[PDB]
Amino acid sequence: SSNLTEEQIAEFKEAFALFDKDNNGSISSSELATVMRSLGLSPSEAEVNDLMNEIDVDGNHQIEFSEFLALMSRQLK
Ligand SMILES: [Ca+2]
Ligand SMILES: [Ca+2]
């Protein structure tokens, strides 16, 4: 769309939680990995930690909502 900010953030917040299976405002390797495991992929730490890392602004084996917004921010249009 052409309007994000609080609009994209709010939408992301709901999505972030989806990734975190504990709602602790934080996501670990498996946490973000369970987002595709139930679909039919069962990725290994390599792919699991990869996702959590690609967004881990600090690099602590997990990412927080705000971090999910830094890497998320849509992708193309
Ligand atoms: Ca958590
Ligand atoms: Ca983090």
UniProtKB/Swiss-Prot annotation:
* PTM description: The N-terminus is blocked.
- Where does it localize? Cytoplasm, Cytoskeleton, Microtubule organizing center, Spindle pole body
Query: Which positions fall inside the EF-hand domain?
Result: 7-42, 43-77
The entry's keywords: Calcium, Cytoplasm, Cytoskeleton, Metal-binding, Phosphoprotein, Repeat
Gene Ontology cellular-component terms listed: actin cortical patch; cell tip; cellular bud; cellular bud neck; cellular bud tip; central plaque of spindle pole body; cytoplasm; incipient cellular bud site
GO annotations under biological process? cell budding; cellular hyperosmotic response; cytoskeleton organization; endocytosis; karyogamy involved in conjugation with cellular fusion; microautophagy; microtubule cytoskeleton organization; phosphatidylinositol biosynthetic process
Q: Where does Ca(2+) 1 bind?
A: D20, D22, N24, S26, E31
Provide any one GO MF term from the record: calcium-dependent protein binding
Q: What is the effect of changing D20A?
A: Highly reduced affinity for Ca(2+)
Top-level taxon of origin:
Eukaryota
Q: Where does Ca(2+) 2 bind?
A: D56, D58, N60, Q62, E67
Q: What does this protein do?
A: Calmodulin mediates the control of a large number of enzymes, ion channels and other proteins by Ca(2+). Among the enzymes to be stimulated by the calmodulin-Ca(2+) complex are a number of protein kinases and phosphatases. Component of the spindle pole body (SPB) required for the proper execution of spindle pole body (SPB) duplication.
**Family stated for the protein in its record:** Belongs to the calmodulin family.
Subunit and partners:
Component of the SPC110 complex containing at least CMD1, SPC29, SPC42 and SCP110. Interacts with SPC110.
Additional remarks: This protein has three functional calcium-binding sites.
Q: What is this protein called?
A: Calmodulin
Source organism = Saccharomyces cerevisiae (strain ATCC 204508 / S288c)
Highest classification ranks of the organism: Eukaryota, Fungi, Dikarya, Ascomycota, Saccharomycotina
